[PDB]
Write a protein that binds this ligand. Structure first.
Ligand SMILES: *[C@@H]1O[C@H](CO)[C@@H](O)[C@H](O)[C@H]1NC(C)=O
Ligand SMILES: *[C@@H]1O[C@H](CO)[C@@H](O)[C@H](O)[C@H]1NC(C)=O
Ligand SMILES: *[C@@H]1O[C@H](CO)[C@@H](O)[C@H](O)[C@H]1NC(C)=O
Length: 2003
C-alpha cells in the first residue's frame, strides 16, 4: 500500500488521459491568446495625449469699455495656452497687450517726439500763424494803412512830386511778388520823399494793430526736430511696422487669410511664442453627439433667402455669397445672430423700458463710430478742393516757395529738399504728370474709407422689440430663428404692463436656443477628464454664443437704473491656470474589458473540467477506485493537480503577452502573475463544487459555463453604486470570486494611471483617503473563497434424502463461512475450496447479494464468522484486500486508454512495483489472447472483448480469491466460450466464485453448486449429485417428416410412468421414469428405434437429461377495427392526449416555457424604464451653490482708494458673496448659517524651516512640481511638499463656504501648485467629481486711459478745419456734438476681474452674477441697508425645433431597439423546448414504433404542430399581459395592441416549423439547446442592429442602397420581421408624437405594407414553407449450399397451394453503397401458421438488417417479400396492421403510466372506444403486471419494462409477431412466466419470429432455426434435427476406493476418439460419438452415471468457430 505512491499512479493516469484529446489541449491554450489580441489592437488604436502648463489671457466684458471688448474678441478667438504666466494675471495689470507694434511705436512717439523740453515751441509757430493768417494775411475789409488789402495793395499813395526810381524798383523788388534794407537809401525833396517806410527789408512788421512781432522765431525749432524725427523713424519699432506693412499694400499679396490674420495679430495683438496651442476636447460623449464619433456631418439646413426690404443692395448681395459659399458657411452662422440679431423683452412697461434704455450704451457708442466714418462723405471733397484750385495753397505755396529768398533757404535746407518735387506735390492740376507721389495717397484713402463706410451699413444697431406675453415672444422667436436673426430674448417674470417702480430685488431670464447654450440637465461631466476644458468651440458656448455679453448688459442696466453712482467699474473674466496633464483614453476600456475578458477566457476550461469530473462518477469508475482502497481526498487532490498543471502554462503566456504587448508598461509582472494565479485556483475549486449537483455529463458540461458566467454579473451593477458601498459590505459581496477580481482590477488601473505600478510596496496601501479596502484584500478574499468552496464541496459530496453432499477429508479450503448473520442470512455454513470453480446459484434478492457484499468486504455483518485464506475480514482488511479481487456486473474501463495501461494501472493499484507489473502484463496478455491490437483504445473494441478485458483484470496481481458475478451476460455465444477458456486456464491454485442467472452456464464450467433459497443453504454438491438426488425421467424426443396412435404402442411394450408430455408441430417429447432397474429394457428400446426409422417415418431421436434449470424452479417454492377517416381522427386525438399527459406532470418544461420568457422580458422592460429621458431642459437658476462644498478665494489689490474699501466690505461681511443670505427669502432649500473668525491653518515645522532658510526670488517663489518625463508619464504632477507657500487665512461664511485671503501673494502660483493636492482627495471614484474650487474675485486693477480729453480735441479739429476752409456740413455738426461722451466710453479706468474654473459648466455666469451683484451694493446711498438688493439670472432655453428633435428621437428609439432584441431572444426559448422532446423521441426509437403501428408521418407532424401552436399561445398571451401591465405607449395603446398581438403570434407560427429540421441533426438534447439559443441570439442581434445603424448615414449614396437591399433580402428570417416590426411600432409613435407638440395630426395606421403590413405577410408565407421542407427532409430519411436450405429455396417457387403462409420473403439483399460484399444475400423462407421461427444469425455476419427491412427502417435493395399477400415493397401501410413488434431497446415515455401507455398503442390501432376498457385489463392480467399497472413507467425495475413492451406488442390480435430479445434482465421465474404466454399464442394459430442471445430460450420455445453466417442461411430444421445432423456427443460421467486406470481401461478398448475431459478425484467425463452403445455396455459395473447430449449452443459455436 501507500499514499505518495497512489498519488503518482493517479496523476500519471490523468496525464495520459489528457494527451489523447489534442483538440481540448489546443483550444485551452489558444483561445485566451486570441481573446487578448484584440486588447492589444485597442491599445495601439488609442494613442496618448500629453500637454504642458496653460495660462490663458483674459476676456473683457462690455462693461469694461468697447475698445477692449472688441480687441479681446479679435485676439482671443482660439483661446491659447502659453506655458508662461500672462501679464494680465498680476496684482495691478489688466492690459495684456503691451507688446503690439502699435503700442511700442506709440510709446516711442510719446517718448521722444512728444514731451520734448528741447523746443516745445511748435505751439509758438502755431500761435504765430494763427495770429498772422487771420488778420494780416487775410485783411479782407478791416481798415489799415495804405499798404494793405485783401490780396494785393501798394503804398504809392501820398505822393506830390512828378517822377532813379527804376533803380529803386529793381533793388527793392527782386523777382518776388507780395505773396532793400539800405539799397534804396544808398542810391539817394528827393532825399525826403523817396523813402517812406522807415521799416527796412526787416521781415517782422505786419500786425501793427496794438503790438505784435514774430518772424525769426522758427530756426531752432525747424532745425532741431528733423534729426530726432530721423532717429524716431529709424527706431526698431518703426522698422517692424514698415516691414510688416510691406504686404497688405502691394499687389498680388494678401489673399491667403493667414498672412492677413498674422499681420493683424502682430499689429494689434502682442502674443509671444507663436501664439498658443489650442487644447482640444476629445469627449463627444458628454453631449450624446453620436455623429462626431460616427463620421456624419452635423450642420443644420441653411436658412431661407429673401430680398430684404429697406436694408441695402450691397449688404443683401453680400449675405447670399457669404451664406452659400462652402468655406465660410459655418463661421458666418456663428456671427450673424450677433451682428444682425434681435432681442425681445416681453413685459412692455415703463420699468422694463427704462432698464433696456440704460442697457443700450454699447450700441449707442458703436453707432457714434458709424456717424464719424460717414462724415467723410462731406469732409473729403472739401479737402480735395484745397489742393487743386485753392486761394490759399495754390496762391501761396504753389506760386512761390519769392523764388530768391526761397532759393537761398532751399540751398541752406536739410539733406535733400527738391523744391521742384515740393511744387510737383503742390497741386499740379493741368499737368497729368504720371514718378508722381501725391494723387495716389488721396486716391487710395478715399477708396479705402468709402469701402469701410459701405461695410458698416450692414449692422443692425436698434435691436430691442417689445411684446406683452411670453407666447407671442416665443412665436416671433421661432419665426426669426428660422431665418437665423435671433439673439436672446429677455423676460421679466415679476412685473405687469403697468409696473412703474422697480422692486428691490430684480429677477429676469435669458431665453436662447440650445445650440448656443450649455444644457440645463447637467452641471458637470459624468466622467472626470484630465483636461482644462479650454476648447474655443465645444467648450465656450457662453462666449461665442453671446449669453455672457447680454447678461452683462442687462445687469449693468438694472444697476444703473436704481443707483446713480456716476463712477463705473468694468468686469474681466480670467480662467484659472492648469498644471500639465496626460489624458489616457485606454483606461476607460481596460477597466471595462479586463475582468470581462478574463472571466470569458476560462468559459471552456470550466465546462471541460466539470464534464470529466461528472463523467468519471457517472460510469461508476469512482466506487471501483474506492473498492481498491483509494480515499476521496486522493481523488480530489489528483483532479486538482490535473486541472492546475495547464492553467499555469496558460497564465505564464498571458503574462508575457500582457507585458510585452504594452497593455501594462510599468507593473512588476511578478505580482500580475501571482494575481492571476489566485483567480485560477478559485475557478478550479469552484469547478469542484459545481461537479456535485449534476448526474449526467452533457448537462453538466452545458450548465457549468453558463452558471460561471452568471456568477460574475453582480459586478456590473456593483460598479455603478460604487460610492454608497462601504468597505464592510464590499468584503461581504466579495465572496463571489469574479467580483473580487474586478475589485482588484480597479486598483490596478488606479495605480497604472499615477506613473507608478504595483511595485510590492503599495499593494497594501490604497489611492484613497479612508476606503480601507486595499489590493491585498482582493487576493486574500480569492484565496479564502477557494477554501470555503472546497469545504462546502467536500461536505456536500458525502451527504449526496441427504442434501449437503459429503466432501473429501480435505483439498485445502480457501474461504470458510460459519453462522453468518445480518439483517437475511440465518447461520448459513458454506465452505469454498481451492482450484475449482463454484457456482453460487441463488435468487434475485433472497440473500445472495447481501452475502456477496459481506464476503467482498464492503459492509459489515453482525456476529458471523468468515475466513479468507487463513485470515479474517474485521481484524485485518489492509492485508486481505491484497489477494482478493473482484469484478462487478458493469465494466471497469477508462475511455481513451489502451489495454497495456489498463493492466499496468490495475497491477500497480493492487500494490506492485513497476517491474513486476510490466512482467505480469506480458504474461496475462498471452493467456488472454490479445497479443495483437494491444495498442488499440479501450473503447471501439468488439464489445465482447471489453468484457473479456474486464474479467481479465480481476485476476491481476497475486490473486487467490476471485468473487466475480455474471461475467458473461449479454455477449454472443462465441465470446462466452472465449471467457470460459480464460477462466479454465486460471483455476490452477486459486479459488473462484461465480454468481450468474443463466443455468446453461452453471454446468459446463462448474464443479460445485450451492443454492441459497430462504436466506440459507439447502443443497451443495456436484451437478451429478443434484441431478440424482431428485429423480426425473430421461426426456426422449422424436421428430417426423413432411401417426401417434401407432407410435404409442412402440413405447407401450416398455411402458414407463409417463406419456406424451408435449407434442408441438413435427415434434414428440417423451418422458420416462428414473431408476427402477430398466437396464436391458431401456437399452433394448433404442434397438428397434434406431433400426426402423424411415419405415416408421421419423428422422431423428435423442435422449437428453433433465435440465439444471428445471430443478432450480422447484427448489424455490379482438373485434372489427376502425379504418379511414375514423382511424385518422382517432390517431390525432390519441397523440394529443399522449403529448398532454407528458407535460401536465413535468416541471422542467414548465419553467422552460413559462418562467424564462416572463423573467427575461420583465428585466428588459425595467431596464427600459430606469433610463433618464432625453431632452426636457428645465429653468435652472444660476448661482455658485448648485455645486457642493467649495473654496472661494479673494484678493484686495490697490487698497487705500475709496469706493473699493466698501466694495471689499459688501462682498465679505454685510450681504456676503452672491445672493444667498439676503434678508427675507431666496430659496428655502439653501438656508443661512453662521460664521467663524479668521484662522490661519498650521504647518509642520519642517515647512516653516525651509522657507526661512533659503532664498526665494520674486520670480521664483516656492518650489516647483515635477512634470512627467519621457518614460514615466503621470496624470498629474508630483508637487513636492510645500508647493504653494504657506497656507492663507480662512473663514467659514454664513453661506457655508470657506473663503481665504490671497492678498499680497502670487496667485498664479498658489493656484497651479495646489490643484493636484485637491483632486487627489476629491477623486477616489472618477464619477461626478467636486473639484472643491470654482472661482473667486480679485478687486483692483487699472489700465491707462487716453489723456486727450474731448472739447480740447474738438478745439484742435475746428481750428485745423477753419485754417484751411473746410467747415464741414450738416452731418459733421451732428456727429461732433457727442464727442466728449464718445471719447469717455472707450475705456473704463478702474475695474475688477473674476477667476473661474471651467470644469463646472455653469461656473462662469454664476460668478459674473456675483461680481455684478456686489458692484450694485457697493454704490447705493448710505441709508438703504444693502442686504436687501440683488439680481438673479435664470437660464431657461427655447423650444426644440423639429430638426433637433430627430436626434432625440434616434436616442429614444435606441433603447427600444434593445427591448426588441430581448423579446426576440426570450421568445426563442419556447420553440427550443419542443425540439428537445422531438430529439428525445427520435432516439430510443419511440417515433419509429408509432410509425410501425401506423401514424403516416404526415399526421404525426401535423398533430405535433397543432399542439405546439396552442402551447406557445399561452406564453405569447402572458408576454402580452406583461406589456399591458407596464402600461407603455406605442404597444398598449388602443390602436397598436392588435399590431402587437398579431406580431407575437405570427412569430411563433413562423419559427416553430423552422427549428423542426434541427431535430434530425442532433442526438443529445443539451447540445441542441445550447447550439439553438446561440444561433437565434446571433441572428437576432445582427438582424435588428445593422439596419438600425445603417440608416443614420444620409450621405454616401451607397449605404442607402446596401441597406435598401438588406431591407428586402433579410426577410427570409422570422427574427428580422419581429425585430423590424417592434422597432417600427416605436419609431412611428415617436414621429406621430413630435407632431402633437406642434399641433398637427399625423394619423398613421399599421397594416399598411410599410410598417408591419409586409412582415405580417412574410410570416404567413414562410410559416407554410418550412413545414413542407420538414416533410421533405423526413421523406428522405424514413451452386454450393446445404440440401435442407436448397430444399426450401426450390420449394419457394410455387406459392399457390401453400399460400396459407404468413411470410413469403421471396428474395432480399442490402448491398451498401460503400461496399462490395452484400450484408444480406438472397434468402427465402416461409412461415407456416402455428410455428415460431428462429432466425438466429452469427454475430458479425449481418442479421439485424433483416429486421430493419421488415419493420420498415431501410430500403429493400432489389427485394421481394410479402406477409399476407401485401408486399413490403409498395403496400407498407395496411400490412403494418398485421404485425406486432417488441424492440431490442425500450421505447417508453418515462412520464406516462403503464395503463395509459397501453391506451395510446390501443388507440393507434383500431379497437373502438368502448372496448379498450376490457382489451387493456385483459393484457394487464395476462402479462402479470397488476401492482405496477399505473405507477409512472420509468420508475420500473428494468425487467418490468420488458413486460410492458411485450404487452404493448401483443395488443389486439395480430396474426404475425416479431420479438427482439423478449427477456434480458429477468430472474428465471419471470422468464418462465413470460415463456408460457408466448407458447399460449403459438398454440392458437398465429406465427412468431424471435431473435435472442441466450440459446436457452431459443431451445425452450421454438420450432425452426436458421443460422445466418457471413452471407445467407446455412442450416435449417428443428432443434433435434440440428442437434443430431450437425453434432455428436453423449457426454458420459461416472463416480467412483477409486482408481482411474480401471475406468480408463474399458474405454481404451472401444469408443475411439474420446477427448477425455475435466478430471477430479472420482469424477470422469468422456465423449462417445453417435452409437448409443454405452447404454447397453454399462452392464459391467465395477455407482452413478448419466448420458446427456450436446446442447444447441455447441452447434452455433461450431459454425462460428471458423471465419
Ligand atoms: C510695457 O512694455 C515695456 C517694454 O516693452 C516696459 O518698459 C513697460 O514697463 C511695460 N509696461 C507694463 C505695465 O508692464
Ligand atoms: C448662528 O446664530 C446664532 C448667533 O447669535 C447662534 O446662537 C447659533 O448657534 C449660530 N449657528 C447656527 C447654526 O445658527
Ligand atoms: C521634515 O522634518 C524632518 C525633521 O528632520 C526631516 O528630516 C524630513 O525631511 C521632513 N519630514 C517630514 C515627515 O516631512
Amino acid at each position: 500500500m501507500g499514499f505518495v505512491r497512489q498519488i503518482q499512479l493517479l496523476l500519471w493516469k490523468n496525464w495520459t488521459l489528457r494527451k489523447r484529446q489534442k483538440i481540448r489541449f489546443v483550444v485551452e491554450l489558444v483561445w485566451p491568446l486570441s481573446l487578448f489580441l484584440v486588447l492589444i489592437w485597442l491599445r495601439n488604436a488609442n494613442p496618448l495625449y500629453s500637454h504642458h502648463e496653460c495660462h490663458f489671457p483674459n476676456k473683457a466684458m462690455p462693461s469694461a469699455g468697447m475698445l477692449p471688448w472688441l480687441q479681446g474678441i479679435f485676439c482671443n478667438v482660439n483661446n491659447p495656452c502659453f506655458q508662461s504666466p500672462t501679464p494680465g494675471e498680476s496684482p495691478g495689470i489688466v492690459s495684456n497687450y503691451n507688446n503690439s507694434i502699435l503700442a511700442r511705436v506709440y510709446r516711442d512717439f510719446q517718448e521722444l517726439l512728444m514731451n520734448a523740453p528741447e523746443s516745445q515751441h511748435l505751439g509758438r509757430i502755431w500761435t504765430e500763424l494763427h495770429i498772422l493768417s487771420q488778420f494780416m494775411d487775410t485783411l479782407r475789409t478791416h481798415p489799415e494803412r495804405i499798404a494793405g488789402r485783401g490780396i494785393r495793395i501798394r503804398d504809392i499813395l501820398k505822393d506830390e512830386e512828378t517822377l532813379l526810381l527804376e533803380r529803386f524798383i529793381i533793388f527793392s523788388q527782386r523777382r518776388g511778388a507780395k505773396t532793400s534794407l539800405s539799397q534804396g537809401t544808398l542810391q539817394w525833396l528827393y532825399a525826403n520823399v523817396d523813402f517812406f517806410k522807415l521799416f527796412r527789408v526787416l521781415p517782422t512788421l505786419l500786425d501793427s494793430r496794438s503790438q505784435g512781432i514774430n518772424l525769426r522765431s522758427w530756426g531752432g525749432i525747424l532745425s532741431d526736430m528733423s534729426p530726432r524725427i530721423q532717429e524716431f523713424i529709424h527706431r526698431p519699432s518703426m522698422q517692424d511696422l514698415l516691414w510688416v506693412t510691406r504686404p497688405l499694400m502691394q499687389n498680388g499679396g494678401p489673399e491667403t487669410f493667414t498672412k492677413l490674420m498674422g499681420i493683424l495679430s502682430d499689429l494689434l495683438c502682442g502674443y509671444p511664442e507663436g501664439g498658443g496651442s489650442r487644447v482640444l476636447s476629445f469627449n463627444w460623449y458628454e453631449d450624446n453627439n453620436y455623429k462626431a464619433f460616427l463620421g456624419i456631418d452635423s450642420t443644420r439646413k441653411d436658412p431661407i433667402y429673401s430680398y430684404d426690404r429697406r436694408t441695402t443692395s450691397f449688404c443683401n448681395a453680400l449675405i447670399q455669397s457669404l451664406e452659400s459659399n462652402p468655406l465660410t458657411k459655418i463661421a458666418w452662422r456663428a456671427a450673424k445672430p450677433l451682428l444682425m440679431g434681435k432681442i425681445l423683452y416681453t413685459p412692455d412697461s415703463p420699468a422694463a423700458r427704462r432698464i433696456l434704455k440704460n442697457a443700450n450704451s454699447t450700441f449707442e457708442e458703436l453707432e457714434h463710430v458709424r456717424k464719424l466714418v460717414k462724415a467723410w462723405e462731406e469732409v473729403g471733397p472739401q479737402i480735395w478742393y484745397f489742393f487743386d484750385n485753392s486761394t490759399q495753397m495754390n496762391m501761396i505755396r504753389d506760386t512761390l516757395g519769392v523764388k530768391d529768398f526761397l532759393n537761398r533757404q532751399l540751398g541752406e535746407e536739410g539733406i535733400t529738399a527738391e523744391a521742384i518735387l515740393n511744387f510737383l506735390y503742390k497741386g499740379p492740376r493741368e499737368s497729368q504728370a504720371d514718378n508722381f507721389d501725391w494723387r495716389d495717397i488721396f486716391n487710395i484713402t478715399d477708396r479705402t474709407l468709402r469701402l469701410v463706410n459701405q461695410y458698416l451699413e450692414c449692422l443692425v444697431l436698434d435691436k430691442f422689440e417689445s411684446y406683452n406675453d411670453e407666447t407671442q415672444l416665443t412665436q416671433r422667436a421661432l419665426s426669426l430663428l428660422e431665418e437665423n436673426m435671433f439673439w436672446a430674448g429677455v423676460v421679466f417674470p415679476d412685473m405687469y404692463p403697468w409696473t412703474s417702480s422697480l422692486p428691490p430685488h430684480v429677477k429676469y431670464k435669458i431665453r436662447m436656443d440650445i445650440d448656443v447654450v450649455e444644457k440645463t440637465n447637467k452641471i458637470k461631466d459624468r466622467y472626470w477628464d484630465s483636461g482644462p476644458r479650454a476648447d474655443p468651440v465645444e467648450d465656450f458656448r457662453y462666449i461665442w454664443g453671446g449669453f455672457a455679453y447680454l447678461q452683462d448688459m442687462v445687469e449693468q442696466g438694472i444697476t444703473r437704473s436704481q443707483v446713480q453712482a456716476e463712477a463705473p467699474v468694468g468686469i474681466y473674466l480670467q480662467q484659472m491656470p492648469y498644471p500639465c496633464f496626460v489624458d489616457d483614453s485606454f483606461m476607460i476600456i481596460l477597466n471595462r474589458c479586463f475582468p470581462i475578458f478574463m472571466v470569458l477566457a476560462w468559459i471552456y476550461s470550466v465546462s471541460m473540467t466539470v464534464k470529466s469530473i461528472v463523467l468519471e462518477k457517472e460510469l461508476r469508475l469512482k466506487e471501483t477506485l474506492k473498492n481498491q482502497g483509494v480515499s476521496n481526498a486522493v481523488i480530489w487532490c489528483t483532479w486538482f493537480l490535473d486541472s492546475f498543471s495547464i492553467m499555469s502554462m496558460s497564465i505564464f503566456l498571458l503574462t508575457i503577452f500582457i507585458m510585452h504587448g504594452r497593455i501594462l508598461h510599468y507593473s512588476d509582472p511578478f505580482i500580475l502573475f501571482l494575481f492571476l494565479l489566485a483567480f485560477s485556483t478559485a475557478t478550479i475549486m469552484l469547478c469542484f463544487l459545481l461537479s456535485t449537483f449534476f448526474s449526467k455529463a452533457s448537462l453538466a458540461a452545458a450548465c457549468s459555463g453558463v452558471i460561471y458566467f452568471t456568477l460574475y454579473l453582480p459586478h456590473i451593477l456593483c460598479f455603478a453604486w460604487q460610492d454608497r458601498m462601504t468597505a464592510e459590505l464590499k468584503k461581504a459581496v466579495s465572496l463571489l470570486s469574479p467580483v473580487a477580481f474586478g475589485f482588484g482590477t480597479e486598483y490596478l488601473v488606479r495605480f497604472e494611471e499615477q506613473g507608478l505600478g504595483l511595485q510590492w510596496s503599495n499593494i497594501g496601501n490604497s489611492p484613497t483617503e479612508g476606503d480601507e479596502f486595499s489590493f491585498l484584500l482582493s487576493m486574500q478574499m480569492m484565496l479564502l473563497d477557494a477554501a470555503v468552496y472546497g469545504l462546502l464541496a467536500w461536505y456536500l459530496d458525502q451527504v449526496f434424502d441427504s442434501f449437503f453432499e459429503r466432501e473429501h477429508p480435505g483439498w485445502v479450503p480457501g474461504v470458510c463461512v460459519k453462522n453468518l448473520v445480518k439483517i437475511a442470512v440465518d447461520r448459513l455454513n458454506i465452505t469454498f475450496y481451492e482450484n475449482q470453480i463454484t457456482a453460487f446459484l441463488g435468487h434475485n434478492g433472497a440473500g445472495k447479494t447481501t452475502t456477496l457484499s459481506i464476503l467482498t468486504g464492503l459492509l459489515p455483518p453482525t456476529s458471523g464468522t468468515v475466513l479468507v485464506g487463513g485470515r479474517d475480514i474485521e481484524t485485518s482488511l489492509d492485508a486481505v484486500r491484497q489477494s482478493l479481487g473482484m469484478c462487478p456486473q458493469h465494466n471497469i474501463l477508462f475511455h481513451h486508454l489502451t489495454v497495456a495501461e489498463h493492466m499496468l494501472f490495475y497491477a500497480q493499484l493492487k500494490g506492485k512495483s513497476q517491474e513486476e507489473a510490466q512482467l505480469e502484463m506480458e504474461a496475462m496478455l498471452e493467456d488472454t489472447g490479445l497479443h495483437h491490437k494491444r495498442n488499440e483504445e479501450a473503447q471501439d473494441l468488439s464489445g465482447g472483448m471489453q468484457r473479456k478485458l474486464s474479467v481479465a483484470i480481476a485476476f491481476v496481481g497475486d490473486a487467490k480469491v476471485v468473487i466475480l458475478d455474471e461475467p458473461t451476460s449479454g455477449v454472443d455465444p462465441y465470446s462466452r466460450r472465449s471467457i470460459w477458456d480464460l477462466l479454465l486456464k486460471y483455476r490452477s491454485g486459486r479459488t473462484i466464485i461465480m454468481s450468474t442467472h443463466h443455468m446453461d452456464e452453471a454446468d459446463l464450467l462448474g464443479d460445485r453448486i450451492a443454492i441459497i433459497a430462504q436466506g440459507r443453504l439447502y443443497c451443495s454438491g456436484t451437478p451429478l449429485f443434484l441431478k440424482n438426488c431428485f429423480g426425473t425421467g430421461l426426456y426422449l424426443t422424436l421428430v417426423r417428416k413432411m401417426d401417434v396412435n401407432e407410435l404409442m404402442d412402440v413405447v407401450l411394450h416398455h411402458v414407463p410412468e409417463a406419456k406424451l408430455v408435449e407434442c408441438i408441430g413435427q415434434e414428440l417429447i417423451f418422458l420416462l421414469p428414473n431408476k427402477n432397474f430398466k437396464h436391458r429394457a431401456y437399452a433394448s428400446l433404442f434397438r428397434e428405434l434406431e433400426e426402423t426409422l424411415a419405415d416408421l417415418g421419423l428422422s431423428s431421436f435423442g435422449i437428453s437429461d433433465t435440465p439444471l434449470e428445471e430443478i432450480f424452479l422447484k427448489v424455490t417454492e379482438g373485434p372489427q377495427l376502425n379504418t379511414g377517416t375514423q382511424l385518422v381522427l382517432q390517431h390525432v386525438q390519441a397523440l394529443l392526449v399522449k403529448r398532454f399527459q407528458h407535460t401536465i406532470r413535468s416541471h422542467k418544461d414548465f419553467l422552460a416555457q413559462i418562467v424564462l420568457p416572463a423573467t427575461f422580458v420583465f428585466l428588459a422592460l425595467m431596464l427600459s424604464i430606469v433610463i433618464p429621458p432625453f431632452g426636457e431642459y428645465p429653468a435652472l437658476t444660476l448661482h455658485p451653490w448648485i455645486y457642493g462644498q467649495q473654496y472661494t478665494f479673494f484678493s484686495m489689490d490697490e487698497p487705500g482708494s475709496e469706493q473699493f474699501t466698501v466694495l471689499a466690505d459688501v462682498l465679505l461681511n454685510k450681504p456676503g458673496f452672491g445672493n444667498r443670505c439676503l434678508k427675507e427669502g431666496w430659496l428655502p432649500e439653501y438656508p443661512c448659517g453662521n460664521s467663524t473668525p479668521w484662522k490661519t491653518p498650521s504647518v509642520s515645522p519642517n515647512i516653516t524651516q525651509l522657507f526661512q532658510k533659503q532664498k526665494w526670488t520674486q520670480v521664483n517663489p516656492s518650489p516647483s512640481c515635477r512634470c512627467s518625463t519621457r518614460e514615466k508619464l503621470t496624470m498629474l504632477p508630483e508637487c513636492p511638499e510645500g508647493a504653494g507657500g504657506l497656507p492663507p487665512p480662512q473663514r467659514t461664511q454664513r453661506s457655508t463656504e470657506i473663503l481665504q485671503d490671497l492678498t499680497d501673494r502670487n496667485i498664479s502660483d498658489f493656484l497651479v501648485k495646489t490643484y493636484p493636492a485637491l483632486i487627489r482627495s476629491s477623486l477616489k471614484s472618477k464619477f461626478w467629481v467636486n473639484e472643491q474650487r470654482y472661482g473667486g474675485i480679485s478687486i483692483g486693477g487699472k489700465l491707462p486711459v487716453v489723456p486727450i480729453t474731448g472739447e480740447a480735441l474738438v478745439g484742435f479739429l475746428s481750428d485745423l478745419g477753419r485754417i484751411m476752409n473746410v467747415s464741414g456740413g450738416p452731418i459733421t455738426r451732428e456727429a461732433s456734438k457727442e464727442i466728449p461722451d464718445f471719447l469717455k466710453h472707450l475705456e473704463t479706468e478702474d475695474n475688477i476681474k473674476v477667476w473661474f474654473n471651467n470644469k463646472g459648466w455653469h461656473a462662469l455666469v454664476s460668478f459674473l452674477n456675483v461680481a455684478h451683484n456686489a458692484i450694485l451694493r457697493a454704490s447705493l446711498p448710505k441709508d438703504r441697508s444693502p442686504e436687501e438688493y440683488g439680481i438673479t439670472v435664470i437660464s431657461q432655453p427655447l423650444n426644440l425645433t423639429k430638426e433637433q428633435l430627430s436626434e432625440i428621437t434616434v436616442l429614444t428609439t435606441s433603447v427600444d431597439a434593445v427591448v426588441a432584441i430581448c423579446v426576440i431572444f426570450s421568445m426563442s426559448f419556447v420553440p427550443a423546448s419542443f425540439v428537445l422532446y422531438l430529439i428525445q423521441e427520435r432516439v430510443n426509437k419511440s417515433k419509429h414504433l408509432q410509425f410501425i403501428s401506423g401514424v403516416s408521418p404526415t399526421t404525426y407532424w401535423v398533430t405535433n404542430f397543432l399542439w405546439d401552436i396552442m402551447n406557445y399561445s399561452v406564453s405569447a398571451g402572458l408576454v402580452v399581459g406583461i406589456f399591458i401591465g407596464f402600461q407603455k405607449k406605442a404597444y398598449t395603446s388602443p390602436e397598436n395592441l392588435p399590431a402587437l398581438v398579431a406580431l407575437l403570434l405570427l412569430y411563433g407560427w413562423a419559427v416553430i416549423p423552422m427549428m423542426y429540421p434541427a431535430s434530425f441533426l442532433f442526438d443529445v438534447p443539451s447540445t441542441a439547446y445550447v447550439a439553438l439559443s446561440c444561433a437565434n441570439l446571433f441572428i437576432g442581434i445582427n438582424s435588428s442592429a445593422i439596419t438600425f445603424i445603417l440608416e443614420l448615414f444620409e450621405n454616401n449614396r451607397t449605404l442607402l442602397r446596401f441597406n435598401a437591399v438588406l431591407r428586402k433580402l433579410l426577410i427570409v428570417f422570422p427574427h428580422f420581421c419581429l425585430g423590424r416590426g417592434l422597432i417600427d411600432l416605436a419609431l412611428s409613435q415617436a414621429v406621430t408624437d413630435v407632431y402633437a407638440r406642434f399641433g398637427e395630426e399625423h394619423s398613421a395606421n399599421p397594416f399598411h405594407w410599410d410598417l408591419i403590413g409586409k412582415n405580417l405577410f412574410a410570416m404567413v408565407v414562410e410559416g407554410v414553407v418550412y413545414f413542407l421542407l420538414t416533410l421533405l427532409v423526413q421523406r428522405h430519411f424514413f451452386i454450393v449450399d446445404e440440401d435442407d436450405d436448397v430444399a426450401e429455396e426450390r420449394q419457394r417457387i410455387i406459392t399457390g397451394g401453400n399460400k396459407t403462409d404468413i411470410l413469403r420473403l421471396h428474395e432480399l439483399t442490402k448491398i451498401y453503397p460503400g461496399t462490395s460484399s452484400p450484408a444480406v444475400d438472397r434468402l427465402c423462407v416461409g412461415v407456416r401458421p402455428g410455428e415460431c421461427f428462429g432466425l438466429l444469425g452469427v454475430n458479425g455476419a449481418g442479421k439485424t438488417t433483416t429486421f430493419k427491412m421488415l419493420t420498415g427502417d431501410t430500403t429493400v435493395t432489389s427485394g421481394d417479400a410479402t406477409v399476407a399477400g401485401k408486399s413490403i415493397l409498395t403496400n407498407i401501410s395496411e400490412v403494418h396492421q398485421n404485425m406486432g413488434y417488441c424492440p431490442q431497446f425500450d421505447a417508453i415515455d418515462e412520464l406516462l403510466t403503464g395503463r395509459e401507455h397501453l391506451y395510446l398503442y390501443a388507440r393507434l390501432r383500431g379497437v373502438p372506444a368502448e372496448e379498450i376498457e376490457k382489451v387493456a385489463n385483459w393484457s394487464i392480467k395476462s402479462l402479470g403486471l397488476t401492482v405496477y399497472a399505473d405507477c409512472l413507467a420509468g420508475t420500473y425495475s428494468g425487467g418490468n419494462k420488458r413486460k410492458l413492451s411485450t404487452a404493448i406488442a401483443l395488443i389486439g390480435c395480430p396474426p404475425l409477431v416479431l420479438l427482439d430479445e423478449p427477456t434480458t434482465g429477468m430472474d428465471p421465474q419471470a422468464r418462465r412466466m413470460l415463456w408460457n404466454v408466448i407458447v399460449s399464442i403459438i398454440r392458437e394459430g398465429r406465427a412468431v419470429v424471435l431473435t435472442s442471445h441466450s440459446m436457452e430460450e431459443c431451445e425452450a420455445l421454438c420450432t425452426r432455426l436458421a443460422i445466418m453466417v457471413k452471407g445467407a442461411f446455412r442450416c435449417m430444421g428443428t432443434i433435434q434435427h440440428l442437434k443430431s445432423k450437425f453434432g455428436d456427443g453423449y457426454i458420459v460421467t461416472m463416480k467412483i476406493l477409486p482408481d482411474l486406470n480401471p475406468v480408463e481401461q474399458f474405454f481404451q478398448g472401444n469408443f475411439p476418439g474420446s477427448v477425455q475431459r475435466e478430471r477430479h478425484y472420482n469424477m470422469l467425463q468422456f465423449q462417445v460419438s453417435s452409437s448409443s452403445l454405452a447404454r447397453i455396455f454399462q452392464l459391467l459395473l465395477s455407482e452413478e452415471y448419466s448420458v446427456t447430449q450436446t446442447t444447441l449452443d455447441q452447434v452455433f459455436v461450431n459454425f462460428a468457430k471458423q471465419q
